[PDB]
Amino acid sequence: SRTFLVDPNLDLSIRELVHRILPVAASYSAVTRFIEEKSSFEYGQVNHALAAAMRTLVKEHLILVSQLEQLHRQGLLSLQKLWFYIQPAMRTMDILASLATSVDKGECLGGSTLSLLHDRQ
Amino acid sequence: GQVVFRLQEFFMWALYKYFISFKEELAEIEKCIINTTITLAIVVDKLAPRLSQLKVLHKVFSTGVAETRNVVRASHLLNTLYKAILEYDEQTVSLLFSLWVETVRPYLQTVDEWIVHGTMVSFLKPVLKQIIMAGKSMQLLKNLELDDVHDPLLAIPHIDKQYLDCCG
Amino acid sequence: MIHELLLALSGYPGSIFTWNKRSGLQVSQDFPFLHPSETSVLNRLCRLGTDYIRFTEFIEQYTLHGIYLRAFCTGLDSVLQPYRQALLDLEQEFLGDPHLSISHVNYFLDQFQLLFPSVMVVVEQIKSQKIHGCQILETVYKHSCGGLPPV
Amino acid sequence: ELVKDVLNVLIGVVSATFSLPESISSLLSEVAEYGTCYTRLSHFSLQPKGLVFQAFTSGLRRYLQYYRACVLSTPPTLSLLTIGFLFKKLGRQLRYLAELCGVAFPTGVKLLSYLYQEALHNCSNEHYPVLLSLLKTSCEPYTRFIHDWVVFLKHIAHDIYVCGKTINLLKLC
Q: How far is CA B61 from CA A117, A119, B15, B139, in A?
């Protein structure tokens, strides 16, 4: 549910494409807040191991941003080239940002958090 | 210009091939004009061995344009070259010869194709009977490099032994 | 004017090289900057452009139906590839030395000038006789036994 | 140089002359209208009603990325006419994909069979692999359903209906 601001004076040929990359960040700022909260004991022994197995993917998402900066130094990273690289991340961090918002909507803990993972590449 | 304009209005693959190389010499000269003094009497004498070779084509092609059936327009043309070369028997001969081979390529193909895949010149008359009797006999078989041999002979029976196998 | 022409030979007509739906590409009239003797060689050069335009217009239109017509156009672009590639080159040679005239540009086409004409009536026989079906694999074959080596 | 303008139309981003001598406009329109179908696809195949329609929608994006991969790869800055000729043998294929989709549309088996009749209709031409790679993945979920119990000739139609219910009956026994 995060909102962003870009620029009053920027090229329109960029802002329309910027708004196509951000939905992987806003869908990320709601997963990292699901980990740091649903790790509290008062949530059962299921909402924990769900937050742990939901953390290894965040680790692999931090490696995918590292390999981009190291590839950015050689200048081989154009904006158009970026929109294609993160596509595996725009699909995964769109799945987890939907479970982490549907497990907290209706307060689930225990079995009712193991049912939702059975109805929901 | 008339000799070259008429040809451009008009076997051609041999003619066309000659023009590209001829064009390169003329095009090259244009380079030395933009980048030495050059005037009229110099470019003409520089082009002597070309304006000579060109005059021949105005007479060789004149017999390939004055003519209706498709078999007389191609026979009378191909026979004019072999006659015009014996008149010239050096650079002018190298042109007509290189112009000849690229125009007899059709016949040499079908002749071979007829062999393996199954109003008269007295040149080949003394053996003509052995040809027809081998040609037609070969065609009834399928339903059920000769020039490259004559030339090596000049260095040191080809058409008859071949026939003997076919009829046999 | 060079880069102007190399587009006219690509399929884009302009003020210098007007386009007519019946005749084909041709020069409009006399131009003061250029010589009055070139007005001919260009017209001789456009007899080639008209072929490529009438080619690509037919290629896009796909017109009659059938796979054997689809594939014929699919292949018809392949033989037409060296024409384009040899046209991109002309610009590179003119980019190097600025002393090259239309004479050299006309000379470069050479092979395309004697090929398109013989491969023009093959298309005309199709659009004028409704050659439908596998009968194309003969109408193209009856013209494959031609003498011209390039064809 | 205008090449970074024309090349940035196949992507969808607007430009100074692309909104949403003098004969170049005619040449520009031939590459322009190519772009109008690329955008007309992402507007149509963006969602992740029917299950088999999703896979076909998921198979299409497996192709467009290649079209986005081929562009922005070869030409840094090439001749203007080179662009039109290079994207002809490929561009016309993009316009053919508009005849296939809408830009109504069947679903279920009605779609898995409609796409099949598009193969024999245009088999030998250059449109065989692209349609095949779609059909090869547009039937992926439907095989799973068939992988449970384990027009077209009716001699086998009614048999499939019973060849499955038997498996679904042994699963409860």
A: 89, 88, 10, 36
Neighbours of B, requiring at least 3 CB pairs below 8 Å, are: C
Name chain A contacts of D65, Cβ cutoff 8 Å: 84, 87
Q: State the maximum Cα–Cα separation within chain A, in Å, rounded to a whole number.
A: 52
CA atoms within 13 A on the CB side of C62: 12
Contact assignment for D72 to A13 by CB distance below 8 Å: no
Q: How far does A90 lie from chain D, in Å, by closest CA?
A: 12
Q: Is C1:C34 a contact under the CB 8 Å cutoff?
A: yes
A20 backbone dihedrals φ, ψ, rounded to 5°? -95, -15
Mutating which of D4, D7, D9, D13 best tests the A interface, going by the most A Cβ atoms within 10 A? D13
**Cα–Cα dist B132/B116, whole Å:** 15
From C99, C136, A28, select the one nearest B31 (Cα to Cα). Answer: C99
H-helix segments, chain C = 2-8, 38-61, 67-79, 81-96, 102-109, 121-127, 136-139
Q: Does D33 touch chain C (CB under 8 A)?
A: no
Residues A90/A23, Cβ–Cβ less than 8 Å: yes
Instruction: Write out the two tokens for B105.
Output: 């390529």
Is C88's CB within 8 Å of D81's CB? yes
Report how far apart, in Å, the C-alpha atoms of B45 and of each of A19, B31, B38, B40, B57 are.
Answer: 74, 18, 12, 9, 20
* Method used experimentally: cryo-EM
For D68, the closest of A13, A78, A84 (CB atoms) is A84
- Token pair for D46: 């963006």
Those chains having 3 or more beta-carbon pairs within 8 angstroms of chain D are A, C
Q: Which chain C residue has the Cα nearest residue B102?
A: C149
Concatenate the DSSP letters of all residues of B33-51 into one string.
HH-----HHHHHHHTHHHH
**Going by C-beta distance under 8 Å and a sequence separation of 6 or more, which residues neighbour residue C84?**
C10, D81, D82, D85
Computed over its alpha carbons, how large is the radius of gyration of chain C?
A: 17
Instruction: Show the tokens assigned to C102.
Output: 């239309």
B23 vs C contacts (CB less than 8 Å)? 107
Pick C60's closest partner by Cβ from D82, D92, D126: D92
- Please name the amino acid found at residue B71: V
Q: Is B20 within 8 Å of chain C by CB?
A: yes
Which of B12, B13, B27 lies nearest to residue C103, judging by beta carbons?
A: B27
Matching residue, tokens 């009053």: A8
Pairing assessment for the beta strands C26-27 and C17-18 based on DSSP bridges: antiparallel
- Give the DSSP letter of residue C20: -
The total number of residues shown for chain B amounts to 168
Element (H, E) at C27: strand C26-27
